[PDB]
Amino acid sequence: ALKRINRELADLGKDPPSSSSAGPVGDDLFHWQATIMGPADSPYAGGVFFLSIHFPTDYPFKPPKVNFTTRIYHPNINSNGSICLDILRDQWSPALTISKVLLSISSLLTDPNPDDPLVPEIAHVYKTDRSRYELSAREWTRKYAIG
Amino acid sequence: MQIFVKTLTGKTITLEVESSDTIDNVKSKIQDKEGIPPDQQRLIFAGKQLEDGRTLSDYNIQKESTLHLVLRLRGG
Amino acid sequence: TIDEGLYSRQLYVLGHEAMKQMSQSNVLIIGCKGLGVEIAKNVCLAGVKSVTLYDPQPTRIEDLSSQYFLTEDDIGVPRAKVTVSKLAELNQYVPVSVVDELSTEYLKNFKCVVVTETSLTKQLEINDFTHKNHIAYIAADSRGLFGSIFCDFGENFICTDTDGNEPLTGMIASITDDGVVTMLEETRHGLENGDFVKFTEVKGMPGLNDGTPRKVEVKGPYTFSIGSVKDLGSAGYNGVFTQVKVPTKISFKSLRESLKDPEYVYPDFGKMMRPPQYHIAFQALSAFADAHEGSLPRPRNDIDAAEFFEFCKKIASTLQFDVELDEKLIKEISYQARGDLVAMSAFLGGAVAQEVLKATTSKFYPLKQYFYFDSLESLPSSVTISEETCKPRGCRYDGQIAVFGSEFQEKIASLSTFLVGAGAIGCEMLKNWAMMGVATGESGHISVTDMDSIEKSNLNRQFLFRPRDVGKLKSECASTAVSIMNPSLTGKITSYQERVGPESEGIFGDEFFEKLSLVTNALDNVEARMYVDRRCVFFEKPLLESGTLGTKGNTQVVVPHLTESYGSSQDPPEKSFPICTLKNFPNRIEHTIAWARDLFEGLFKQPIDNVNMYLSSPNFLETSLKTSSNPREVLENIRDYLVTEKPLSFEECIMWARLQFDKFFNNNIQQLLFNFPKDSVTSTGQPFWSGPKRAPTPLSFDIHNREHFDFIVAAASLYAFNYGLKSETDPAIYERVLAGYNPPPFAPKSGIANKDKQELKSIADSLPPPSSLVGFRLTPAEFEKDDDSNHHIDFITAASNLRAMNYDITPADRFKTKFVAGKIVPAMCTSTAVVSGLVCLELVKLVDGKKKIEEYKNGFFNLAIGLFTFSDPIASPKMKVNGKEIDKIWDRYNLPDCTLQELIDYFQKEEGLEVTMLSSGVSLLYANFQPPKKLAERLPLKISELVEQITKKKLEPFRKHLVLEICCDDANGEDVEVPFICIKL
Numbered sequence A: 001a002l003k004r005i006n007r008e009l010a011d012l013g014k015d016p017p018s019s020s021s022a023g024p025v026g027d028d029l030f031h032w033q034a035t036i037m038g039p040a041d042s043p044y045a046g047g048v049f050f051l052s053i054h055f056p057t058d059y060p061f062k063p064p065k066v067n068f069t070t071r072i073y074h075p076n077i078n079s080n081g082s083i084c085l086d087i088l089r090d091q092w093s094p095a096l097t098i099s100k101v102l103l104s105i106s107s108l109l110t111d112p113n114p115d116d117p118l119v120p121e122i123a124h125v126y127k128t129d130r131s132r133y134e135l136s137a138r139e140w141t142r143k144y145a146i147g
Numbered sequence B: 001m002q003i004f005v006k007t008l009t010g011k012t013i014t015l016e017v018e019s020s021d022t023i024d025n026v027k028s029k030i031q032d033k034e035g036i037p038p039d040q041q042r043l044i045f046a047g048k049q050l051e052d053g054r055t056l057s058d059y060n061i062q063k064e065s066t067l068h069l070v071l072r073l074r075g076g
Numbered sequence C: 001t002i003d004e005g006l007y008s009r010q011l012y013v014l015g016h017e018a019m020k021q022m023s024q025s026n027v028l029i030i031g032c033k034g035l036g037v038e039i040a041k042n043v044c045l046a047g048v049k050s051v052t053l054y055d056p057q058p059t060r061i062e063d064l065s066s067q068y069f070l071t072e073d074d075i076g077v078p079r080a081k082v083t084v085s086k087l088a089e090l091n092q093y094v095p096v097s098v099v100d101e102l103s104t105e106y107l108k109n110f111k112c113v114v115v116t117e118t119s120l121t122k123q124l125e126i127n128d129f130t131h132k133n134h135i136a137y138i139a140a141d142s143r144g145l146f147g148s149i150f151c152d153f154g155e156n157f158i159c160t161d162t163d164g165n166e167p168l169t170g171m172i173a174s175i176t177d178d179g180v181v182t183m184l185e186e187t188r189h190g191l192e193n194g195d196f197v198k199f200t201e202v203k204g205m206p207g208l209n210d211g212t213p214r215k216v217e218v219k220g221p222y223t224f225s226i227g228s229v230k231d232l233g234s235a236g237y238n239g240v241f242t243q244v245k246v247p248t249k250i251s252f253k254s255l256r257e258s259l260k261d262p263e264y265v266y267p268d269f270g271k272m273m274r275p276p277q278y279h280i281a282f283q284a285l286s287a288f289a290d291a292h293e294g295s296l297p298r299p300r301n302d303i304d305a306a307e308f309f310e311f312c313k314k315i316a317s318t319l320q321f322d323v324e325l326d327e328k329l330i331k332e333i334s335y336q337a338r339g340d341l342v343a344m345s346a347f348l349g350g351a352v353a354q355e356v357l358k359a360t361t362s363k364f365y366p367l368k369q370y371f372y373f374d375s376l377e378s379l380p381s382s383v384t385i386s387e388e389t390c391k392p393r394g395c396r397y398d399g400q401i402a403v404f405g406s407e408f409q410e411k412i413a414s415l416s417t418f419l420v421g422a423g424a425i426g427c428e429m430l431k432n433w434a435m436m437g438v439a440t441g442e443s444g445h446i447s448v449t450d451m452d453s454i455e456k457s458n459l460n461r462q463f464l465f466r467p468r469d470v471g472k473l474k475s476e477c478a479s480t481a482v483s484i485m486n487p488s489l490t491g492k493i494t495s496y497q498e499r500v501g502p503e504s505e506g507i508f509g510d511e512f513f514e515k516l517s518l519v520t521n522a523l524d525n526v527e528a529r530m531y532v533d534r535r536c537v538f539f540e541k542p543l544l545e546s547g548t549l550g551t552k553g554n555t556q557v558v559v560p561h562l563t564e565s566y567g568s569s570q571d572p573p574e575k576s577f578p579i580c581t582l583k584n585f586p587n588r589i590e591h592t593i594a595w596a597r598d599l600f601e602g603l604f605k606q607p608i609d610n611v612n613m614y615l616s617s618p619n620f621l622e623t624s625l626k627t628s629s630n631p632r633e634v635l636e637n638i639r640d641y642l643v644t645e646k647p648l649s650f651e652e653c654i655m656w657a658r659l660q661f662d663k664f665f666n667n668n669i670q671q672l673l674f675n676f677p678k679d680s681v682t683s684t685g686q687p688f689w690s691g692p693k694r695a696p697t698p699l700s701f702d703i704h705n706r707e708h709f710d711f712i713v714a715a716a717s718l719y720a721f722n723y724g725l726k727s728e729t730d731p732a733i734y735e736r737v738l739a740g741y742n743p744p745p746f747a748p749k750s751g752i753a754n755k756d757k758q759e760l761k762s763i764a765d766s767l768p769p770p771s772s773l774v775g776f777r778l779t780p781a782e783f784e785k786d787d788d789s790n791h792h793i794d795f796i797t798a799a800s801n802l803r804a805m806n807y808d809i810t811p812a813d814r815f816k817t818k819f820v821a822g823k824i825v826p827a828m829c830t831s832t833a834v835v836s837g838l839v840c841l842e843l844v845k846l847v848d849g850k851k852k853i854e855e856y857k858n859g860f861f862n863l864a865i866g867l868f869t870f871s872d873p874i875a876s877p878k879m880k881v882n883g884k885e886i887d888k889i890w891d892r893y894n895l896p897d898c899t900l901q902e903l904i905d906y907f908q909k910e911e912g913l914e915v916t917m918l919s920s921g922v923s924l925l926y927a928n929f930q931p932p933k934k935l936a937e938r939l940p941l942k943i944s945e946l947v948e949q950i951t952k953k954k955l956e957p958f959r960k961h962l963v964l965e966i967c968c969d970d971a972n973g974e975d976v977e978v979p980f981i982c983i984k985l
Ligand SMILES: Nc1ncnc2c1ncn2[C@@H]1O[C@H](COP(=O)(O)OP(=O)(O)OP(=O)(O)O)[C@@H](O)[C@H]1O
Pocket: B075, B076, C009, C420, C421, C422, C423, C424, C425, C449, C450, C451, C452, C457, C458, C474, C498, C499, C500, C501, C522, C523, C524, C525, C528, C825, C827
C-alpha cells in the first residue's frame, strides 16, 4: 500500500501532469486532493475542479474513492460529486495508476455519454436542446469553477 | 498437448498447451476462458502449487494431466 | 414448518425441500467412539428425524482420547447409554435413542445405517441385507493417521442435484437461424457441453419460450448452440436463458462385490499408488483382529507388524491384486492401529455426516465408493517413537500416545496458543485442543478472544452453546464448556471480549505475543485475517488460517522464515453494481434489493442522525454548511423531521407512508419516462430501452394488493418507531385512514444567482432553537436482519418487490431478500468439522518444529462434489541486498531510536543505499522531494518525536516499537526493495 502510493507520488513529482496536480492532504498518504483543468474545447474551459481521492486500506486491490468537490453540470456527474466511471466500481485492477484515472476523468469531461446517464434531466437537455446545455454548463463553470 | 483444469465448484476446462509453455501462458488461457485474473488463480498439480516464471516441464506436466483451480474462503 | 430461526444458515446450503426430506429420515449409528459420536453430533445438528445408537461395549479410559461426551466417572458403563443423554441436548427437534440389541430385520426402520468399529464379517452381514432392501449404507474406519470411508446407496440411486450450484441464467443478444445463441456484450454464459437451457422473453422466436429444455454445445466463452431452430423462426432478438438441471442415476455395488474390484476416490493426486495399498491393509487389519480375539496390533510392535504383513501378503494373493506391497507403509498402518486421534475423527466424521445427508436428501454427488486417506506427514521426527515410548500409561491420552509417544505428549502439554474468534471453527478447535491435551502442562496456556454474543441461529453449528446461553459472551461459554470436557484445563484458559484490531494493541501487545507458541484464526472477514497476519509476521509466530463457505473449505499454514504470509496472495473481491444501474436502470432483483436497502437507510437512519446531531452539537449548522456536500439536504431533513412532517398519531404515519409510496413508486418513474420516453432512441438510432434497460411503468396504489399493503404497514411502523408512537396491525384502521386520501397533483418538470443563500438562511432560522427542545431525541433505525419483528426485512422486501413490479422484474420472497440484503454467509457443521480436523493435523506438524516445506500441506475441499486437494505452501521470496540474501517477508532492520539524519547516514554507510522515502502507519515522515526548509526542520529530530509531531498524537505508554516502511535507491539510481525497519523505543 504505502510503497505503491509513494511510487505513484514520486512518479507524479518527476513528470508534472501539466493538466492535473494530485498530492497527499497534509501528511496523510491515503487522502489526496487533485485538481483538473477544464479542457479548452469543452463547455468547462477556463475552470479548475477539485477532486478528493480516498485510498482504501487494501490498495491497490480495491479502487480508490474519487469524488468531485466543485459542482459541475455534467450528465455523468451528480450533485454529490459521484462519477459514473467503470474503472472505479468493478473494472478496477491493481495495475491502473492515479494518472490514468485522472486522464479518464478528463476524457469524460471532454465528451459526456447521455446514452447511459447518471443524471437523466441533464442527459435529456443534452440530447434534445444542446444549446441550453452549453449555456447551463458555462454558467455553472463560471459561478462555481472560477474563483 | 491437452490438459484439463477442474474448479472447486465442479467445472471442467480443456486447454491446448505445449510442454514448453510457462505458467503465465496457462494462467492467461484460464483468464480468457473464465475471466479470472492470473494473480487470483491457484493451480495445483500433483500436490504442488504452480508458480509464475516456471515452465510446465519443470513440474513434469504431460498430456491429459489434471490441474485443480482453487480459492480461499472467508467464512468460518 | 422448518424453524428458520434455527436453520437459517443451513437452509441457504440445502434448501427447504432437502430439509423437508431430512426431517422424515431415520439414521442408525453403530459404534459410539470418537468417530461415531462425531457423526452422531453432526447428524443431530443437521436436523434428521431421529438418531438411534448401538454400542453395548463398556467404556474404557483410552476411549476418552477422542470421545468428548465421556468422562472418567463413566468407566465401566456402556458407551451408548452414557452418550445418549448428552446427544439429546444438541437439538430439541431430533430425538436420540439407544437399542441394547440389534437384529437384521430391525434395519428396515432406518433411512441410513452408519457402521464404525465393526469387523468385516459383520459388515458383510449388514450390507447383504441393506443392499437388497434399498437402505443407504456407510462404513467408516479410523486407524491412527489413516482413515477409510465406504458408501453404498443402492443400485438405483437418484441424484437430483449433482454439483450444488445455482442454475445459470443470462441475457441473450441474438439467436441466429442455426441456434447460435450469443450473449450480451462481455458476458459469459458459463455453461458446459451437454447442459440443458430454457428460454423466455425471446422476440421473433415464440417457440423457444414454451419451456422445453434444449441441449447446449459450447462454442466459446460468449456463444453457444442449441441446434436447428429453422421451423420456429428466422432470428430471435433479446430474451433470457436459464439452465435446467436434470436428475442422474447412480448405481452402487455391494461391499462383497466392491472388495474384489474397488472404485477409489483420491483425496490427493500426489500419491495415487497408496489407496490400493490401504485397501489390502484394512482387510488385513480385520483378519488380524479376527485371529486375535478382536485385538489390534500393539503400538510399534515388530512381531505384530510381521504377522500383519503376512496377512497382507495372503490377502493380496487371494484377491488377485497385482500391486507390489510397500512394506514400510503397510507396517506403518500396523504400528498405528490402536491410535485414536480427535483430528482424524473430526475430519472423517464431517465427511461421513455429509454423506449421510446426501443419502437422506438425494442431493449432491456421493462418494463412489472407497475413500482412503492418510496424514502420515504428521508423524513426529524430533522425538523418539518406539515400543517403549508408545506403550499405554492408563491415561485418557492413550489413543494419542499410541501414535506420537509420551515425549510428544509433553511437548503438546506445554503449548501457549492464541485463538482468535469463537464461532463454529473456534468451538471445534477448542474441542480438539481439549481432547488432545493442549496446554494442560505446567507451562501451558490458552487465550481465546471474541467480542460477539450467542444468538439463536448460532446454535445450529456451534455445539458448545445451548439455548440457555443465548445472550451471553461466546468466549466465556466456550471456555467453560471445554473445561467441563477436559477438567485438566481448569484455570488454564483466559477469555477476552476484545476485538482483535488496531484498537486492542494495549491488551495484545509485545508482552502478550512474545509468550505465544502459535496463533489460530477462526474469523469470518478478511480485514481481521490480514491484521492478525501482519502481527504474526512482526512477532514471527506460526499462524493457522482456515475458512469455510457452504460445503467448501480451505486451510493454510504460515511458518516463520519458511513460507509466505496470508496476505501475500489475492482473493476475488466483492462485486458492487454501478451507481447508474442501481439508481435508474435495474434489471436484476439484486439491484432492487440494494436500492431498497439504500432507501431504508435514507428514510429511517440518516435524517434521524442529522436531527439528533443538530439538537446536540451547538455549532452543527455552520459545520454542516461548510463541510457537507449538500447542506440543503441536511437543512430540509432537519426541518421535515422536526416541524413540517412530525407525526402526532399513527394515522399521520400511515399518511406519510402513502405519500412515500407515491413519491418512490409513481412520481420518479413518471419523471424518468418524461426524460426518456419509451419510444426514444440513442444517438446511434438504437432504441433506448433495449437490452439491460427495461422500460418502467408507474404503479397506482391499490389497497387490496398485498405488496402495496405490506409496504404501507412496514413504512408506517418504522416511522412510528422513529417517533416512538404505538403502531397497530389491524387492516381495518389502515383501510379506513387510506380511504379518505386525496393525492396531490403531480406533473413532470421540464426544467427551464446567490439569492438561494437567503432561502437557506430562512430555512435555518425557521428551525426551532435547540434550547426549546431539551431531552428530546429521535430513535434511529439500526438494520438488524435476525429479528423478524422490527419490520426491517419486511420493508426491504416490500420496497424491492414494488420496484421490481416497476421494471417488470421477477420478485423474491423474504428468504432470498434476507440472504441478499443481510450478506448472510451459508454455513454448515460438516465443513466446520473437516476444517478443524485439517487444522489440527497441521498443528502437530507445527509442534514438532518441522523445517522442510514439503512436510506442510494447505488443504482445499468441496464436500458437495467430494473433492479434496492438498498442496505444499509457497516459499517466501528472496532478494539480494548489498550482496546478501534477505528474506522478503520475514526479515527486518533493528535500529535504536536515533535521529532522522542518523538513520539516513546509517543507511547510506552501512547498506550503501540512499533513502528516498520513509513512512510510518499512514503518514509520510520523510521524502526526498520535500522542500529544504521542512527537512532542516525535521532532520535533527528523533524518530519517536518526528512521528508524534507529524501525527499530532503522543505515543501510548505501552508502545514499545515502531514499524517503518522505507524506499531507497542504490548508487546508480535504481530502486532496490528492502525490508521494513523496527525502531526500538
Ligand atoms: N476482529 C475480530 N476479533 C475477534 N473476533 C472476531 C472478529 N471478527 C469476527 N470475530 C468473531 O469470529 C466469529 C466468526 O464465526 P461465525 O461467522 O461462524 O459467527 P457469527 O458471525 O456470529 O455468525 P453468522 O455469520 O452465522 O451470523 C464470530 O464469533 C465473530 O464474533
